[PDB]
Write a protein that binds this ligand. Structure first.
Ligand SMILES: C[C@@H]1O[C@@H](O[C@@H]2[C@@H](O[C@H]3O[C@H](CO)[C@H](O)[C@H](O)[C@H]3O)[C@@H](O)[C@@H](CO)O[C@H]2O)[C@@H](O)[C@H](O)[C@@H]1O
Ligand SMILES: C[C@@H]1O[C@@H](O[C@@H]2[C@@H](O[C@H]3O[C@H](CO)[C@H](O)[C@H](O)[C@H]3O)[C@@H](O)[C@@H](CO)O[C@H]2O)[C@@H](O)[C@H](O)[C@@H]1O
Lengths: 307, 307
């Protein structure tokens, strides 16, 4: 049978699947108090993409299309196009355009556009609030608040490149809310075709998150961003498409230097990881360590307590 | 022997290896009038990374470190740290920090920083001119021109996220110059440990470039960006590390739908591609097509004319 495997990349050599930035560390903790249902970075070990997950690490949280000024403000409406600048098809059985951000927050970046006729270009700092009623990706439109009100032109390809997140008001780190999905269709209707919510079912286990620190652009934002799978893992499963021989793949985090294993964990065929541990914990790992698929096991396999 | 292969991704599903943006099209044309010696996106089919090439698609053209204001200006000096925020080692036998931009141009993006003590954050538009004498990556420092002169703090992690390129003066598209390497050490000394220059040696052949359109942020910039290998190809060869059985791997661009081949090309073990064609040409390809390694051939193999 097509042997299953995970890439041999180290945590720092990989990218976060929920925002275009590299992974930084591994984190585990209880999740019973949240609804863990991210839409980006979702894929079966079988290679089946889920939610709004797409292959490009750099295309996550980016938008493309054309814009029109909101008279009397420094705001603009962008009529979305697909990443390749083609028409966006709302008919597809997906939650929203692939790569759409999957959390409620204020993402700041830059809008850039070129005038086809003469090749003149321009850029403006802008922020898109995913918690806003005007955040309607699925319907084909999103809104930005910018610093300008006269330089962006109508009917010209425009792109939004994400940089980081901002926060307002006292009560620091109150936003963004990484575990709260935005309303892809606004008030027009509920979210559709979502990748399922995830939770550790085996007693004594907790989810293992691949963590990054989203850059902050203003205020006191909660910058923690946890994904269920590194972007390269999504890329790998997709191309390998190896058949899962059980519902659980046993992985060992090994140090290529010493050749020794640090801990083992469960990669569920559904596309998420759990370890045997109770309580929040920032994992200390050798910079050169990586994951290695060792064997398929039963869903009733008890993991060696994490260390 | 470990069978050699290239990823099954389509052009649009892949990323440019010289700037954090997706690939858009395939381009070929004469290169005898230029010095094709890019440092990013360089890797042997064997999996040996070259120049300033690193694995992360999102880390290309990004800088990390701390900054200090240049009194009397809106400029800042950044003392570089490695991508993981650790000390930058100038001793390494590399041209400059992995991921350093490899072309002379004015790259605009945003500097973001967080104050460790209270978690307050800030962001400012900034541009780094790689043709400036102050562009000294290899020495551990680069300079930015910004829109502020009082909000960035000293001794605080700061990151530069690239967005696009700008241009000044009449004579449009004069810059950037994608084939002109910047002086990594400034005037302190010549560039060192460069990946070799590349050129088609076989009569009737031209290099095959993987092209993207860098977003423009101001003026009339030449936005064309050609890399020798998709970033995922670099990632793939690195992990696969399959032994080259000849100096030339024959690839066929195939359409997974019709199952038919469009054209064939040469992937030199050194890490670049050539096709049989004379003159500039924007390749028209089926959106679902991809490359497939079919066989190792002699360096004297004549390619079927490209179509
Ligand atoms: C927490 C605080 O956030 C930033 O300040 C914002 C402020 O932004 C503007 O003013 C600052 C300093 O005067 C910089 O120039 C920014 O570039 C400006 O955009 C506004 O968003 C107001 C609205 O209440 O709140 C402040 O907190 C940041 O610049 C500060 O350094 C600091 O991190
Ligand atoms: C080619 C031209 O480039 C941009 O204009 C720049 C200009 O930028 C400022 O002014 C414009 C319009 O007044 C926008 O507000 C920008 O956001 C500003 O930064 C400067 O760089 C000057 C210096 O000569 O040159 C202009 O060409 C762009 O905004 C224009 O739309 C246009 O594409």
């Amino acid at each position: 049978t097509k042997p299953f495997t995970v890439p041999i990349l180290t945590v720092e050599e990989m990218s976060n699947s929920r925002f275009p930035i590299p992974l930084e560390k591994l984190y585990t903790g209880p999740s019973s108090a949240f609804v863990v249902q991210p839409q980006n970075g979702r894929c079966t070990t079988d290679g089946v993409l889920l939610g709004t997950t797409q292959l490009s690490a750099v295309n996550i949280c980016t938008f493309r299309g054309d814009v029109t000024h909101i008279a009397g403000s420094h705001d603009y409406i962008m009529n979305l196009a697909s990443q390749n600048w083609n028409n966006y098809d709302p008919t597809e059985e997906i939650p929203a355009p692939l790569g759409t951000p999957d959390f409620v927050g204020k993402i700041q970046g830059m809008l850039t556009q070129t005038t086809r006729e003469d090749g003149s270009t321009r850029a403006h700092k802008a922020t898109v609030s995913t918690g806003s009623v005007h955040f309607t990706p699925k319907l084909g439109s999103v809104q930005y608040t910018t610093d300008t009100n006269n330089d962006l032109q109508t009917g010209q390809n425009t792109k939004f490149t994400p940089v980081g997140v901002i926060q307002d008001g006292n009560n620091h780190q109150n936003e963004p809310q990484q575990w709260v999905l935005p309303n892809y269709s606004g008030r027009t209707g509920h979210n559709v075709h979502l990748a399922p919510a995830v939770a550790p079912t085996f007693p004594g286990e907790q989810l293992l998150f691949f963590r990054s620190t989203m850059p902050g652009c203003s205020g006191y934002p909660n910058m923690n961003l946890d994904c269920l799978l590194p972007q390269e893992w999504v890329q790998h499963f997709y191309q390998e498409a190896a058949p899962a021989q059980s519902d659980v793949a046993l992985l060992r985090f090994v140090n290529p230097d010493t050749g020794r294993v640090l801990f083992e964990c469960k990669l569920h065929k559904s596309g998420y990881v759990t370890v045997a541990h109770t309580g929040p914990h920032d994992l200390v790992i050798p910079p050169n360590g990586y994951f290695r698929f060792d064997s398929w096991v039963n869903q009733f396999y008890t993991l060696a307590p994490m260390g």
